[PDB]
Amino acid sequence: GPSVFLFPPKPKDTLMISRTPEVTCVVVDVSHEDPEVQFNWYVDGVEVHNAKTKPREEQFNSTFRVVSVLTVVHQDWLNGKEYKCKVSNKGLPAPIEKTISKTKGQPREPQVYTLPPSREEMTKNQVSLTCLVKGFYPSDIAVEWESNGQPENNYKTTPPMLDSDGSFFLYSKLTVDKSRWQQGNVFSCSVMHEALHNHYTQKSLSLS
Amino acid sequence: GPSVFLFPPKPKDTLMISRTPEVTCVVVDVSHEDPEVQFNWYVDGVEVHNAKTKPREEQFNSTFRVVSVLTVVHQDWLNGKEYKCKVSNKGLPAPIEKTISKTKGQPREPQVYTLPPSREEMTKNQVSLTCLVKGFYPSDIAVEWESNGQPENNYKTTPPMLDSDGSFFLYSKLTVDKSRWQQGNVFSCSVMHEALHNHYTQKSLSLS
Ligand SMILES: *[C@@H]1O[C@H](CO)[C@@H](O[C@@H]2O[C@H](CO)[C@@H](O[C@@H]3O[C@H](CO[C@H]4O[C@H](CO)[C@@H](O)[C@H](O)[C@@H]4O[C@@H]4O[C@H](CO)[C@@H](O)[C@H](O)[C@H]4NC(C)=O)[C@@H](O)[C@H](O[C@H]4O[C@H](CO)[C@@H](O)[C@H](O)[C@@H]4O[C@@H]4O[C@H](CO)[C@@H](O)[C@H](O)[C@H]4NC(C)=O)[C@@H]3O)[C@H](O)[C@H]2NC(C)=O)[C@H](O)[C@H]1NC(C)=O
Ligand SMILES: *[C@@H]1O[C@H](CO)[C@@H](O[C@@H]2O[C@H](CO)[C@@H](O[C@@H]3O[C@H](CO[C@H]4O[C@H](CO)[C@@H](O)[C@H](O)[C@@H]4O[C@@H]4O[C@H](CO)[C@@H](O)[C@H](O)[C@H]4NC(C)=O)[C@@H](O)[C@H](O[C@H]4O[C@H](CO)[C@@H](O)[C@H](O)[C@@H]4O[C@@H]4O[C@H](CO)[C@@H](O)[C@H](O)[C@H]4NC(C)=O)[C@@H]3O)[C@H](O)[C@H]2NC(C)=O)[C@H](O)[C@H]1NC(C)=O
């Protein structure tokens, strides 16, 4: 009894023409005696044929794992085109069909807010700078940090939370040596999200 | 083939003598033909006998569900005592054993920081006030908000995130009408966590 899992591309993959968005079709618990698999892909029901089917991998539990990767057009996904994977195995009476697309909902533009460390935080040798992203829909988003055009390393972001009003929000937290902050260095969280003009925005933060 | 799941109490249950901490032993996919179950509980291997075993509930998939609830002593769990559930069913060749205890690790005191809304946020009719809890271990924690001793309603908190240094942190976000904030009302996130003196602390925030 095999099952299939269908993964969407990653947000910023989608948002940057530069990047390569992929839809991933994963089939597990494939019969170890009859490992032969057939993938079929569809774009709004339209069969396409450009998917790279990876070599089957033997797992440690007497099953195989089978991955099919479809390259997608940025705009296509953005315009909410459907991607359906069909998987046909001889040890299964009917082929499995999963489908995925950009989540159905009105797009909503993220509001970004930079926030100092707390007065009391100025006790410790590390401070936390606070990026705040809210109101956005869907959930698919990415934040980064940087200073002097160079990306910062020591930050962490939450996974998006559902807000009362059906929007999502999240916080990003960049920690830095107090000295940097007090020297008046400028830092900015950058946010990628389909609702943004050019899918990107930057909001800066430095000690007043 | 039944399975068991063993749930810990909830943080603040543990932290307030007032509250009632419970350890929950859940057994699912119990045979619909042979539904007869036997629970056994243990405190550091020591069998106790004070658990309330709930009536078995027929599920919609031809299985039963069986819950056993053990009341625990606040200090006991706090001192990291072990709670092992044994489940014995006739349709299973060996009884299932799960065990749980306060997570193993050095306790670490949460640092709480209140943070204004962003200057730019003062555009909208709703603002966000920002409670920040960091450095804590373990993860089991709870935040609330209040003003004028009355609990606030419209806030949301993230689930704890793992921080670089093996600590957890999280943010709480309380939204309020701009007018309240500009009137100079005082708001404070309150945090319950075992590392706190008296398991509690409060940090306030009002417009300067
Ligand atoms: C033999 O050993 C095998 C290898 O270990 C093992 O295979 C594994 O099988 C499980 C199923 O039991 C399967 O689990 C699914 O995982 C989905 C996410 O997979 C992630 O994360 C894991 C680890 O965290 C990674 O190892 C995977 O590679 C994968 O990572 C992603 O991979 C893709 C491409 O490779 C990347 O693009 C991603 O970036 C990357 N992510 C990360 C974080 O790195 C998970 O979503 C599945 O959840 C759904 O099914 C569960 C039941 O299995 C339900 O509990 C749950 O509710 C989900 O249901 C769905 O919910 C959706 C809404 O959220 C709906 O849309 C769906 O309709 C609904 N239901 C479905 C589809 O049923 C799931 O947990 C693993 O993927 C798989 N391992 C690998 C490596 O492929 C075998 O089980 C072993 N067999 C036996 C018999 O023991
Ligand atoms: C027939 O229909 C039945 C009823 O719907 C159904 O029963 C369900 O079976 C599934 C297993 O498939 C079982 O899922 C487990 O759920 C655990 C959490 O349960 C929560 O959340 C659900 C919904 O979100 C609630 O409905 C539950 O009541 C329960 O809520 C909690 O309940 C307790 C007491 O009631 C409260 O105190 C809590 O406050 C409350 N929570 C909330 C949010 O309200 C989940 O933790 C389990 O995860 C582990 O097993 C998975 C495999 O099933 C793994 O993918 C996963 O990795 C986990 O593995 C563990 O990881 C741990 C570390 O994190 C380790 O410690 C463990 O060692 C390791 N492994 C284990 C134990 O295997 C799990 O998903 C449901 O609980 C159960 N439903 C109910 C209502 O009890 C049947 O499946 C149906 N049968 C069939 C054949 O279809």
Coordinates of C-alpha atoms and ligand atoms in Angstrom, one line a residue:
Chain A
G1 CA 0.0 0.0 0.0
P2 CA 2.0 3.0 -1.3
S3 CA 1.1 6.6 -0.7
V4 CA 2.1 9.9 -2.4
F5 CA 3.0 13.3 -1.1
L6 CA 3.0 16.4 -3.3
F7 CA 5.2 19.4 -2.3
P8 CA 4.9 23.0 -3.6
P9 CA 7.9 25.1 -4.4
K10 CA 9.3 27.5 -1.9
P11 CA 8.1 31.0 -1.7
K12 CA 11.1 32.9 -2.8
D13 CA 11.7 30.4 -5.5
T14 CA 8.4 31.5 -6.9
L15 CA 9.0 35.2 -6.4
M16 CA 12.4 35.6 -8.1
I17 CA 12.5 35.0 -11.8
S18 CA 16.1 34.1 -11.1
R19 CA 15.2 31.1 -9.0
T20 CA 13.9 27.6 -10.0
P21 CA 10.5 26.6 -8.6
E22 CA 9.8 22.9 -8.5
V23 CA 6.8 20.7 -7.6
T24 CA 7.8 17.5 -5.9
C25 CA 5.9 14.2 -6.2
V26 CA 7.0 11.7 -3.6
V27 CA 5.8 8.1 -3.5
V28 CA 6.7 6.0 -0.5
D29 CA 5.9 2.4 0.8
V30 CA 6.3 1.3 -2.8
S31 CA 6.4 -2.5 -3.1
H32 CA 9.9 -4.0 -2.6
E33 CA 8.9 -7.0 -4.9
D34 CA 7.2 -4.9 -7.5
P35 CA 9.1 -1.5 -7.6
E36 CA 8.0 -0.3 -11.0
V37 CA 6.4 3.1 -11.0
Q38 CA 4.8 5.4 -13.6
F39 CA 4.4 9.1 -13.0
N40 CA 2.0 11.4 -14.9
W41 CA 1.8 15.2 -14.5
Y42 CA -1.0 17.7 -15.4
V43 CA -1.2 21.5 -15.8
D44 CA -4.9 22.5 -15.4
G45 CA -5.7 18.9 -16.5
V46 CA -3.2 19.4 -19.4
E47 CA -0.6 16.7 -19.5
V48 CA 3.0 17.8 -19.8
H49 CA 6.1 15.7 -20.1
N50 CA 9.0 17.7 -18.8
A51 CA 9.3 16.2 -15.3
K52 CA 12.6 14.7 -14.1
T53 CA 11.9 11.3 -12.6
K54 CA 14.7 10.4 -10.0
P55 CA 16.2 7.0 -9.5
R56 CA 14.2 4.9 -7.0
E57 CA 15.8 4.6 -3.6
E58 CA 15.7 1.5 -1.4
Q59 CA 14.6 2.4 2.1
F60 CA 15.6 0.5 5.3
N61 CA 12.1 -0.8 5.9
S62 CA 11.7 -3.0 2.8
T63 CA 10.1 -0.2 0.8
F64 CA 11.2 2.0 -2.1
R65 CA 11.0 5.8 -2.4
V66 CA 10.2 7.5 -5.7
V67 CA 10.6 11.2 -6.5
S68 CA 9.3 13.1 -9.5
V69 CA 10.3 16.8 -9.9
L70 CA 8.4 19.2 -12.1
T71 CA 10.0 22.6 -13.0
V72 CA 7.2 25.2 -13.1
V73 CA 6.8 28.6 -14.6
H74 CA 6.9 31.4 -11.9
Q75 CA 3.9 33.2 -13.4
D76 CA 2.0 29.9 -13.9
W77 CA 2.0 29.1 -10.2
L78 CA 1.5 32.8 -9.4
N79 CA -1.6 32.8 -11.6
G80 CA -2.7 29.7 -9.6
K81 CA -2.4 26.9 -12.1
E82 CA -3.1 23.4 -10.9
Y83 CA -0.5 20.6 -10.7
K84 CA -1.7 17.1 -10.4
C85 CA 0.5 14.1 -10.0
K86 CA -0.7 10.6 -11.0
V87 CA 1.2 7.5 -9.8
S88 CA 0.5 4.1 -11.2
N89 CA 2.0 0.9 -9.7
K90 CA 1.2 -2.7 -10.5
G91 CA 0.9 -3.6 -6.8
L92 CA -2.0 -1.1 -6.5
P93 CA -5.5 -1.5 -8.1
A94 CA -6.0 2.2 -8.9
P95 CA -3.4 5.0 -9.6
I96 CA -3.1 7.7 -6.9
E97 CA -3.9 11.4 -7.7
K98 CA -2.8 14.4 -5.8
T99 CA -3.1 18.0 -6.9
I100 CA -1.8 21.3 -5.6
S101 CA -1.9 25.0 -6.4
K102 CA -1.3 28.3 -4.8
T103 CA -3.7 28.4 -1.9
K104 CA -7.1 29.8 -2.6
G105 CA -7.6 33.2 -1.1
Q106 CA -7.3 37.0 -1.6
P107 CA -3.7 38.0 -1.6
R108 CA -2.9 40.5 1.2
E109 CA 0.1 42.8 1.5
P110 CA 2.5 42.3 4.4
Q111 CA 3.1 45.3 6.8
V112 CA 6.7 45.3 7.9
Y113 CA 7.8 46.9 11.2
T114 CA 11.3 47.2 12.6
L115 CA 11.6 47.5 16.4
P116 CA 14.4 48.3 18.7
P117 CA 15.7 46.1 21.5
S118 CA 14.0 46.8 24.8
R119 CA 15.7 49.4 27.1
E120 CA 16.2 46.6 29.7
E121 CA 17.8 44.3 27.0
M122 CA 20.7 46.8 27.0
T123 CA 22.0 44.8 30.0
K124 CA 23.4 41.9 28.0
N125 CA 26.2 41.6 25.4
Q126 CA 23.7 40.5 22.8
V127 CA 20.6 42.4 21.8
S128 CA 17.6 41.5 19.8
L129 CA 16.3 43.5 16.9
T130 CA 12.8 42.8 15.9
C131 CA 11.2 42.5 12.5
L132 CA 7.5 42.2 12.3
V133 CA 5.5 41.1 9.4
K134 CA 1.7 41.0 9.6
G135 CA -1.5 41.1 7.6
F136 CA -0.2 38.8 4.9
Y137 CA -2.0 36.2 2.9
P138 CA -1.1 33.6 2.0
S139 CA 1.5 32.2 4.4
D140 CA 4.1 31.5 1.8
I141 CA 6.7 34.1 2.6
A142 CA 10.4 34.6 3.4
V143 CA 12.3 37.1 5.5
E144 CA 16.0 37.7 5.6
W145 CA 18.3 40.2 7.4
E146 CA 21.3 42.2 6.3
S147 CA 23.6 45.1 7.1
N148 CA 25.9 47.0 4.8
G149 CA 24.4 45.0 2.0
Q150 CA 25.8 41.8 3.6
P151 CA 23.4 39.2 4.8
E152 CA 23.3 38.6 8.6
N153 CA 23.7 35.1 10.0
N154 CA 22.3 35.0 13.5
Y155 CA 18.6 35.6 13.1
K156 CA 15.6 33.3 13.5
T157 CA 12.1 33.6 12.2
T158 CA 8.9 32.0 13.4
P159 CA 6.6 30.1 11.2
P160 CA 3.6 32.2 10.2
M161 CA 0.7 32.3 12.7
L162 CA -3.0 32.7 11.9
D163 CA -4.3 36.0 12.9
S164 CA -7.9 36.7 14.2
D165 CA -8.8 38.3 10.9
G166 CA -7.7 35.3 8.7
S167 CA -4.3 36.9 7.9
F168 CA -1.0 35.6 8.9
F169 CA 1.8 37.3 10.7
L170 CA 5.2 36.5 12.1
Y171 CA 8.3 37.9 13.8
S172 CA 11.9 37.8 12.9
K173 CA 14.6 38.1 15.6
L174 CA 18.2 39.1 14.8
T175 CA 20.6 39.1 17.6
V176 CA 23.8 41.1 17.4
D177 CA 26.6 42.2 19.7
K178 CA 25.5 45.2 21.7
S179 CA 28.5 47.2 20.5
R180 CA 27.4 47.0 16.8
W181 CA 24.0 48.4 17.8
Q182 CA 25.5 51.2 19.9
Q183 CA 27.9 52.1 17.2
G184 CA 24.8 53.0 15.1
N185 CA 25.0 50.3 12.5
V186 CA 22.0 49.9 10.2
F187 CA 20.1 46.7 9.8
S188 CA 17.1 45.8 7.7
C189 CA 14.9 42.8 7.4
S190 CA 13.9 42.2 3.8
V191 CA 10.7 40.5 2.9
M192 CA 9.7 38.6 -0.1
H193 CA 5.9 38.0 -0.6
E194 CA 3.6 38.0 -3.7
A195 CA 1.6 40.8 -2.3
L196 CA 4.5 43.2 -2.4
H197 CA 5.3 45.5 -5.3
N198 CA 8.1 43.6 -7.0
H199 CA 7.5 40.8 -4.4
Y200 CA 10.0 42.5 -2.1
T201 CA 10.4 45.2 0.5
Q202 CA 13.0 46.5 3.0
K203 CA 12.6 48.3 6.3
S204 CA 15.6 49.5 8.2
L205 CA 16.5 49.9 11.8
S206 CA 19.4 51.7 13.5
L207 CA 19.8 53.4 16.9
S208 CA 18.4 57.0 16.9
Chain B
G1 CA -3.0 -3.2 16.4
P2 CA -3.6 -0.5 19.0
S3 CA -1.3 2.3 19.9
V4 CA -0.9 4.6 22.9
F5 CA -0.2 8.3 23.3
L6 CA 0.9 9.9 26.6
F7 CA 0.2 13.6 27.2
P8 CA 1.9 15.8 29.8
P9 CA 0.1 18.4 31.8
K10 CA -0.1 22.0 30.6
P11 CA 2.6 24.4 31.8
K12 CA 0.5 26.7 34.0
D13 CA -1.4 23.8 35.4
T14 CA 2.0 22.7 36.7
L15 CA 3.0 26.1 37.9
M16 CA 0.0 27.1 40.0
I17 CA -0.7 25.1 43.1
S18 CA -4.3 26.2 42.4
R19 CA -4.5 24.3 39.2
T20 CA -4.9 20.6 38.4
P21 CA -2.1 19.0 36.4
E22 CA -3.0 15.7 34.7
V23 CA -1.1 13.1 32.7
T24 CA -3.2 11.6 29.9
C25 CA -3.0 8.1 28.6
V26 CA -4.7 7.7 25.3
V27 CA -5.1 4.3 23.6
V28 CA -6.5 4.2 20.0
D29 CA -7.3 1.6 17.2
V30 CA -8.4 -0.7 20.0
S31 CA -10.1 -3.8 18.7
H32 CA -13.8 -3.4 18.0
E33 CA -14.4 -7.1 18.7
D34 CA -12.3 -7.3 21.8
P35 CA -12.6 -3.8 23.4
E36 CA -11.4 -4.8 26.9
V37 CA -8.5 -2.7 28.2
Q38 CA -6.4 -2.6 31.4
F39 CA -4.4 0.5 32.4
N40 CA -1.5 0.4 34.8
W41 CA 0.3 3.6 36.1
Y42 CA 3.8 4.1 37.7
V43 CA 5.6 6.9 39.6
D44 CA 9.4 6.2 39.3
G45 CA 8.5 2.6 38.7
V46 CA 6.2 2.8 41.8
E47 CA 2.7 1.6 40.9
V48 CA -0.1 4.0 42.0
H49 CA -3.8 3.5 41.8
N50 CA -5.5 6.9 41.7
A51 CA -6.1 7.3 38.0
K52 CA -9.6 7.9 36.6
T53 CA -10.2 5.6 33.7
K54 CA -12.8 7.1 31.3
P55 CA -15.6 5.2 29.5
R56 CA -14.4 3.7 26.1
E57 CA -15.7 5.6 23.1
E58 CA -16.6 4.0 19.8
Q59 CA -15.0 5.8 16.9
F60 CA -16.3 6.1 13.4
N61 CA -13.6 3.8 11.9
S62 CA -14.5 0.5 13.7
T63 CA -12.1 1.3 16.6
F64 CA -12.4 2.3 20.2
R65 CA -10.7 5.1 22.1
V66 CA -9.6 4.7 25.7
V67 CA -8.4 7.5 28.0
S68 CA -6.8 7.3 31.4
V69 CA -6.2 10.4 33.4
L70 CA -3.7 10.6 36.2
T71 CA -3.8 13.6 38.6
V72 CA -0.2 14.5 39.5
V73 CA 1.4 16.5 42.3
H74 CA 2.8 19.8 41.1
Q75 CA 6.1 19.4 42.9
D76 CA 6.5 15.8 41.7
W77 CA 6.5 16.7 38.1
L78 CA 8.5 19.7 38.9
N79 CA 11.1 17.5 40.6
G80 CA 11.0 15.5 37.4
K81 CA 9.3 12.3 38.4
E82 CA 8.5 9.7 35.8
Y83 CA 5.1 8.6 34.7
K84 CA 4.7 5.4 32.8
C85 CA 1.5 4.1 31.4
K86 CA 1.0 0.4 30.7
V87 CA -1.8 -0.8 28.5
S88 CA -2.8 -4.4 28.2
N89 CA -5.3 -5.7 25.7
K90 CA -6.3 -9.3 24.8
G91 CA -5.9 -8.6 21.1
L92 CA -2.3 -7.6 21.6
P93 CA 0.6 -10.1 22.4
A94 CA 2.5 -7.7 24.7
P95 CA 1.3 -4.7 26.8
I96 CA 2.3 -1.2 25.5
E97 CA 4.6 1.0 27.7
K98 CA 5.1 4.7 27.4
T99 CA 6.7 7.0 29.8
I100 CA 7.0 10.8 30.2
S101 CA 8.6 13.4 32.5
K102 CA 9.6 17.0 32.5
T103 CA 12.1 17.2 29.7
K104 CA 15.7 16.6 30.6
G105 CA 17.7 19.8 30.7
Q106 CA 19.0 22.7 32.8
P107 CA 16.2 25.1 33.5
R108 CA 16.8 28.6 32.2
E109 CA 15.1 31.9 33.2
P110 CA 13.0 33.7 30.6
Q111 CA 13.9 37.3 29.8
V112 CA 10.8 39.4 29.1
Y113 CA 10.8 42.5 27.0
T114 CA 7.9 44.8 26.2
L115 CA 8.2 46.7 22.9
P116 CA 6.2 49.6 21.4
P117 CA 4.4 49.5 18.2
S118 CA 6.5 50.8 15.3
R119 CA 6.3 54.6 14.4
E120 CA 5.0 53.6 11.0
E121 CA 2.2 51.4 12.6
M122 CA 0.7 54.5 14.0
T123 CA -1.0 54.8 10.6
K124 CA -3.7 52.1 11.3
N125 CA -6.6 52.0 13.8
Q126 CA -5.1 48.9 15.4
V127 CA -1.6 48.8 16.8
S128 CA 0.5 45.9 17.9
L129 CA 2.3 45.7 21.3
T130 CA 5.1 43.3 21.5
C131 CA 6.0 40.9 24.3
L132 CA 9.2 39.1 24.0
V133 CA 10.3 36.1 25.9
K134 CA 13.7 34.5 25.3
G135 CA 16.4 32.4 26.8
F136 CA 14.0 30.0 28.4
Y137 CA 14.3 26.2 28.9
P138 CA 12.4 24.2 28.8
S139 CA 9.7 25.1 26.2
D140 CA 6.7 24.6 28.5
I141 CA 5.5 28.2 29.1
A142 CA 2.5 30.4 29.0
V143 CA 2.0 34.1 28.3
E144 CA -1.0 36.2 28.9
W145 CA -1.9 39.9 28.6
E146 CA -3.9 42.3 30.7
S147 CA -4.6 45.9 31.5
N148 CA -6.2 47.5 34.6
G149 CA -5.9 44.0 36.1
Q150 CA -8.3 42.7 33.5
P151 CA -7.1 40.1 30.9
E152 CA -6.9 41.2 27.3
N153 CA -8.6 39.2 24.6
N154 CA -7.0 40.1 21.3
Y155 CA -3.5 38.8 21.5
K156 CA -1.7 35.9 19.9
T157 CA 1.4 34.0 20.9
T158 CA 3.8 31.9 18.8
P159 CA 4.8 28.5 19.7
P160 CA 8.3 28.6 21.2
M161 CA 11.3 28.4 18.8
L162 CA 14.6 26.8 19.3
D163 CA 17.3 29.4 19.6
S164 CA 20.9 29.0 18.4
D165 CA 22.2 28.4 21.9
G166 CA 19.7 25.7 22.8
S167 CA 17.2 28.0 24.5
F168 CA 13.7 28.8 23.3
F169 CA 12.1 32.0 22.7
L170 CA 8.8 33.4 21.5
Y171 CA 6.9 36.5 20.9
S172 CA 3.4 37.6 22.0
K173 CA 1.4 40.1 20.0
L174 CA -1.4 42.1 21.5
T175 CA -3.4 44.3 19.2
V176 CA -5.5 47.2 20.5
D177 CA -7.3 50.3 19.2
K178 CA -4.8 53.0 18.5
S179 CA -6.9 55.4 20.8
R180 CA -6.2 53.2 23.9
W181 CA -2.5 53.3 23.3
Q182 CA -2.5 57.1 22.7
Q183 CA -4.5 57.7 25.8
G184 CA -1.6 56.2 27.7
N185 CA -3.2 53.0 28.9
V186 CA -0.8 50.5 30.5
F187 CA -0.6 46.9 29.3
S188 CA 1.6 44.1 30.5
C189 CA 2.3 40.6 29.3
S190 CA 2.5 38.1 32.2
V191 CA 4.7 35.1 32.0
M192 CA 4.5 31.8 33.7
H193 CA 7.6 29.6 33.7
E194 CA 9.3 27.3 36.1
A195 CA 12.5 29.3 35.9
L196 CA 10.8 32.4 37.3
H197 CA 10.8 33.3 40.9
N198 CA 7.4 32.2 42.0
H199 CA 6.9 30.9 38.4
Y200 CA 5.6 34.3 37.3
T201 CA 6.7 37.7 36.1
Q202 CA 5.2 40.8 34.7
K203 CA 6.6 43.5 32.4
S204 CA 4.5 46.6 31.6
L205 CA 4.2 48.8 28.6
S206 CA 2.6 52.2 28.1
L207 CA 3.3 55.2 25.8
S208 CA 6.0 57.4 27.2
Ligands
LIG1 C1 10.0 3.6 5.4 O1 10.9 4.7 5.5 C2 10.5 5.8 4.7 C3 11.6 6.9 4.7 O2 11.9 7.3 6.0 C4 9.2 6.4 5.2 O3 8.7 7.4 4.3 C5 8.0 8.5 4.9 O4 6.6 8.2 5.0 C6 5.9 9.3 5.7 C7 4.5 8.8 5.9 O5 4.4 8.0 7.1 C8 6.0 10.6 5.0 O6 5.5 11.6 5.9 C9 4.9 12.7 5.2 O7 5.8 13.8 5.3 C10 5.3 15.0 4.7 C11 6.5 15.9 4.8 O8 7.7 15.1 4.4 C12 8.8 16.0 4.7 O9 9.4 15.9 6.0 C13 10.2 14.8 6.2 C14 10.8 14.9 7.6 O10 10.3 16.0 8.4 C15 11.3 14.7 5.2 O11 12.1 13.6 5.4 C16 10.7 14.6 3.8 O12 11.6 14.6 2.8 C17 9.8 15.8 3.5 O13 10.6 16.9 3.5 C18 10.3 17.7 2.3 O14 10.7 17.1 1.1 C19 10.4 17.8 0.0 C20 10.9 17.0 -1.2 O15 11.8 16.0 -0.8 C21 11.1 19.2 0.0 O16 10.7 20.0 -1.1 C22 10.8 20.0 1.3 O17 11.5 21.1 1.5 C23 11.1 19.0 2.5 N1 10.7 19.5 3.8 C24 11.5 19.6 4.9 C25 10.9 20.1 6.2 O18 12.7 19.4 4.8 C26 4.1 15.5 5.4 O19 3.6 16.7 4.8 C27 3.0 14.4 5.4 O20 1.8 14.8 6.2 C28 0.6 14.3 5.7 O21 0.4 12.9 5.9 C29 0.4 12.5 7.3 C30 0.3 10.9 7.4 O22 1.4 10.3 6.9 C31 -0.7 13.1 8.1 O23 -0.5 13.0 9.5 C32 -0.8 14.6 7.8 O24 -2.1 15.1 8.3 C33 -0.6 15.0 6.4 O25 -1.9 14.8 5.7 C34 -2.2 15.8 4.7 O26 -2.5 17.1 5.2 C35 -2.5 18.0 4.1 C36 -2.7 19.4 4.6 O27 -1.6 19.8 5.4 C37 -3.4 17.7 2.9 O28 -3.1 18.4 1.8 C38 -3.4 16.2 2.6 O29 -4.6 15.9 1.8 C39 -3.4 15.3 3.8 N2 -3.1 14.0 3.7 C40 -2.4 13.0 3.2 C41 -1.5 13.3 2.0 O30 -2.4 11.8 3.6 C42 3.6 13.0 5.9 O31 3.8 13.1 7.3 C43 7.4 11.0 4.5 O32 7.4 12.0 3.5 C44 8.2 9.7 4.0 N3 9.7 10.0 4.1 C45 10.3 10.5 3.0 C46 11.8 10.7 3.2 O33 9.8 10.7 1.9 C47 8.1 5.3 5.3 O34 7.0 5.7 6.0 C48 8.7 4.0 6.0 N4 7.6 3.0 5.9 C49 7.2 2.3 6.9 C50 6.0 1.3 6.6 O35 7.6 2.4 8.0
LIG2 C1 -10.0 6.2 14.0 O1 -10.3 7.6 14.5 C2 -9.5 7.9 15.6 C3 -10.1 9.2 16.2 O2 -10.0 10.3 15.2 C4 -8.0 8.0 15.3 O3 -7.3 8.2 16.5 C5 -6.2 9.1 16.4 O4 -5.0 8.3 16.0 C6 -3.9 9.2 15.7 C7 -2.7 8.3 15.2 O5 -2.9 8.1 13.8 C8 -3.5 10.0 17.0 O6 -2.5 10.9 16.5 C9 -1.5 11.3 17.5 O7 -1.9 12.6 18.0 C10 -1.0 13.1 19.0 C11 -1.7 14.4 19.4 O8 -3.1 14.1 19.6 C12 -3.7 15.4 19.8 O9 -4.2 16.1 18.7 C13 -5.3 15.7 18.0 C14 -5.7 16.5 16.9 O10 -4.7 17.5 16.6 C15 -6.5 15.6 19.1 O11 -7.7 15.1 18.4 C16 -6.1 14.6 20.2 O12 -7.1 14.6 21.2 C17 -4.8 15.1 20.8 O13 -5.1 16.4 21.4 C18 -4.6 16.4 22.8 O14 -5.4 15.5 23.6 C19 -4.9 15.5 25.0 C20 -5.8 14.6 25.8 O15 -7.0 14.2 25.0 C21 -4.9 16.9 25.6 O16 -4.3 16.9 26.9 C22 -4.2 17.9 24.7 O17 -4.4 19.3 25.2 C23 -4.7 17.8 23.3 N1 -4.0 18.6 22.2 C24 -4.6 19.5 21.5 C25 -3.8 20.2 20.4 O18 -5.8 19.8 21.5 C26 0.4 13.3 18.4 O19 1.3 13.8 19.5 C27 0.9 11.9 17.9 O20 2.2 12.1 17.2 C28 3.1 10.9 17.3 O21 2.7 9.8 16.5 C29 2.6 10.1 15.1 C30 2.1 8.8 14.4 O22 0.7 8.7 14.7 C31 4.0 10.5 14.6 O23 3.8 11.1 13.3 C32 4.7 11.6 15.4 O24 6.1 11.6 15.1 C33 4.5 11.3 16.9 O25 5.5 10.3 17.3 C34 6.1 10.6 18.6 O26 7.0 11.7 18.7 C35 7.2 12.0 20.1 C36 8.1 13.2 20.2 O27 7.4 14.4 19.7 C37 7.8 10.8 20.9 O28 7.7 11.1 22.3 C38 7.2 9.5 20.6 O29 8.0 8.4 21.0 C39 6.9 9.3 19.1 N2 6.0 8.3 18.6 C40 4.9 7.6 18.8 C41 4.1 7.7 20.1 O30 4.5 6.9 17.9 C42 -0.1 11.3 16.9 O31 -0.2 12.0 15.7 C43 -4.6 10.7 17.7 O32 -4.3 11.0 19.0 C44 -5.9 9.8 17.7 N3 -7.1 10.7 17.9 C45 -7.6 10.8 19.1 C46 -8.8 11.7 19.2 O33 -7.2 10.3 20.2 C47 -7.6 6.7 14.6 O34 -6.3 6.9 14.1 C48 -8.5 6.2 13.6 N4 -8.0 4.9 13.1 C49 -7.8 4.6 11.8 C50 -7.2 3.3 11.6 O35 -8.1 5.4 10.9

